[PDB]
């Protein structure tokens, strides 16, 4: 057996390689790479032994069953979809949240999570938005960017970290800010916040809330 090799054929466009069939044949050296032509588990017992069936026949059959589906392709699960991100959303960009309790607030974009949702921080002290996920389809990416290239985002701030935790109701159950989350908030805020204060009036900008007014039309203005 042999270690796998990086595809010798660089991608020209999607679905077309750089090199023709015979160019690849020489690259792969195929001229010299020629080639020519349990269901039962035995056990003891106090008869002596019993041959046991691993999987048993069903004890019940419904009166009717649905047939099998025809076979398709390209219908991947969600976890295997490719994630896209608007070119205008680069780390440090100031976004405008359009939905939720935080609608209208101006936040700082950190990174895109593996599920494709955006990770943002208020920061909490400027507008009371914690490390929070948000959909890129529901944010207006402004042209205001801060340089957070030197910001270390904890590796454990992943999708499962932000996934809501079920609460049972038999009265009501309330959400409790875990102590870990507070420690996490400071780790990222304590870096981004001084970077905000390097830009004059940026902190005041992130305190204010976006709104439309008389004579202001989105198609006319630049964010």
């Amino acid at each position: 057996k042999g270690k796998p090799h990086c595809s010798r054929n660089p991608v020209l466009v999607r679905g077309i390689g750089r090199y023709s069939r015979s160019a690849m044949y020489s690259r792969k050296a195929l001229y010299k790479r020629k080639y020519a032509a349990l269901a039962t588990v035995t056990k003891p017992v106090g008869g002596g032994t019993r041959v046991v069936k691993l999987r048993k026949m069903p004890r019940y059959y419904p009166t009717e069953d649905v047939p099998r589906k025809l076979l398709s392709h390209g219908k991947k699960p969600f976890s295997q979809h490719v994630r896209k991100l608007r070119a205008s959303i680069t780390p440090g960009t100031i976004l405008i949240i359009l939905t939720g309790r935080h609608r209208g607030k101006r936040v700082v974009f950190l990174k895109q999570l593996s599920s494709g949702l955006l990770l943002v921080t208020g920061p909490l002290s400027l507008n009371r938005v914690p490390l929070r996920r948000t959909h890129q389809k529901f944010v207006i990416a402004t042209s205001t960017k801060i340089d957070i290239s030197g910001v270390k985002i904890p590796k454990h701030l992943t999708d499962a970290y932000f996934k809501k935790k079920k609460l049972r109701k038999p009265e009501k159950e309330k959400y409790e800010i875990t102590e870990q989350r507070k420690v996490d908030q400071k780790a990222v805020d304590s870096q981004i916040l001084p970077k905000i204060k390097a830009v004059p009036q940026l902190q005041g900008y992130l305190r204010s809330v976006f709104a439309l007014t008389n004579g202001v039309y989105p198609h006319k203005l630049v964010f």
Partner: peptide
């Protein structure tokens, strides 16, 4: 045959 030759291909093999």
């Amino acid at each position: 045959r030759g291909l093999r």
